[PDB]
Amino acid sequence: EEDAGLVAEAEAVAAGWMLDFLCLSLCRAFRDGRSEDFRRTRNSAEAIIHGLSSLTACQLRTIYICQFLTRIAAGKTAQFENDERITPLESALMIWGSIEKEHDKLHEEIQNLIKIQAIAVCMENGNFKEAEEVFERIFMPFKSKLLMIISQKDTFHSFFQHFSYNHMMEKIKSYVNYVLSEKSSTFLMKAAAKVVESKR
Amino acid sequence: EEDAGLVAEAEAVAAGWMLDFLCLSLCRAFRDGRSEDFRRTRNSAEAIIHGLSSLTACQLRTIYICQFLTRIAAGKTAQFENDERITPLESALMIWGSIEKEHDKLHEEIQNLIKIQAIAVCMENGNFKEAEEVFERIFMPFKSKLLMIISQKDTFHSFFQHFSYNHMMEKIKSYVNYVLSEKSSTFLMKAAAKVVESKR
Ligand SMILES: CCC(=O)Nc1nc(C)cs1
Ligand SMILES: CCC(=O)Nc1nc(C)cs1
């Protein structure tokens, strides 16, 4: 009586719904600074994504936005540096430059803040040899200036204050706001909101 | 403009929907013998359950059915025996006897098949000292007979053939069929099936 292929198709539809809902919830937690909520939603989304073997262009964009935000959230934080041999912010830079999206003023701004902050977070943590290793992997007159700053442990140089962590976060949060509005009307959240508003 | 408490409430409604959907999908995979699908759905449900801090009586019953099926699936399979210091089937027996459900003929049948199979799976794996340790933790004249069988490595005794692994699995699958029918109409699966049927 039950068609296994049609049941599997229903599960793939629901998986797609859960992925969109979890991306919106991950975006909100990132915007709100709710770290534990972000960590729990990330774990849920990673597990749901594991239940999918074929993804559409839209779904690939959704999982790469989640991966990007995950690296950014881990920015100032071992096994990753053994698995990928790079820093979270360098990994975020790789995802950022490969997501199927427009390379507008905001994309270039976020990209440049990530490139500088990938060096600055190492200096903030006192690992200046790592800061030089990050610089060499990423990266004129300007390049020489940046290397001198790293070399002179000039963590609070006016350049790092302009291309700061807070500025990187504000620019990323601005991008997240577009994604948040784009997925604010997905099936799961739209149906869940209706239940809440009905109570009442 | 956005109420954080109402948004959090929508997320808790959706979490409840995802939990019910994932339990139904875990039940189907267990009934069908789709091990990799069961493992993926279990990982997804464990992650979603982590996003919930308050559970209703119905939701507690749902997570305990998932926990029970997980132990049963791990029945013939180290860290668990260091974390809980017991075997999966003994852990399943503990969940089974504490789920808020009726202790009918089927419940007693499944309970007794689990009690015997917890000893038999150790003998099947060649760990007869473990079989005696399991027997001592769980547990006349009958008890002496069972200890003699274990002691004489009589794995294929007529008793173990009547209280077999296959019989345990068939009785558990029979119980799963009631749960499967109970949750076959949950919001997520009902809405997902409608999408599939609309395409056709
Ligand atoms: C390496 C795989 C990975 O990072 N996956 C992630 N998916 C989400 C949803 C966050 S991180
Ligand atoms: C020990 C916790 C645990 O086993 N949780 C599980 N939840 C599911 C959904 C399967 S196993």
UniProtKB/Swiss-Prot annotation, chains A, B:
User: Which post-translational modifications are recorded for this protein?
Assistant: Phosphorylated preferentially on Ser-151 in an ATM-dependent manner in response to ionizing DNA damage. ADP-ribosylation by TNKS1 or TNKS2 diminishes its ability to bind to telomeric DNA.
Residues shown, of full length: 61 to 268 of 439
Q: Which residues form a coiled coil?
A: none
What is the induction comment?
Answer: Expression is tightly regulated during the cell cycle; levels are low in G1 and S phase and increase during G2 phase and mitosis.
UniProt comment concerning the protein's domains: The acidic N-terminal domain binds to the ankyrin repeats of TNKS1 and TNKS2. The C-terminal domain binds microtubules.
Q: Which residues carry this modification: Phosphoserine?
A: S151
> What residue spans carry the region label TRFH mediates dimerization?
1-200
Q: Name one GO biological process term.
A: negative regulation of telomeric D-loop disassembly
Q: What is this protein called?
A: Telomeric repeat-binding factor 1
What's the encoding gene here? TERF1
Annotated localization: Nucleus; Cytoplasm, Cytoskeleton, Spindle; Chromosome, Telomere
Question: Keywords of this protein's UniProt record, alphabetized?
Answer: Acetylation, ADP-ribosylation, Cell cycle, Cell division, Chromosome, Cytoplasm, Cytoskeleton, DNA-binding, Isopeptide bond, Mitosis, Nucleus, Phosphoprotein, Telomere, Ubl conjugation
The UniProt feature for the cross-link Glycyl lysine isopeptide (Lys-Gly) (interchain with G-Cter in SUMO2) gives its location as: K145
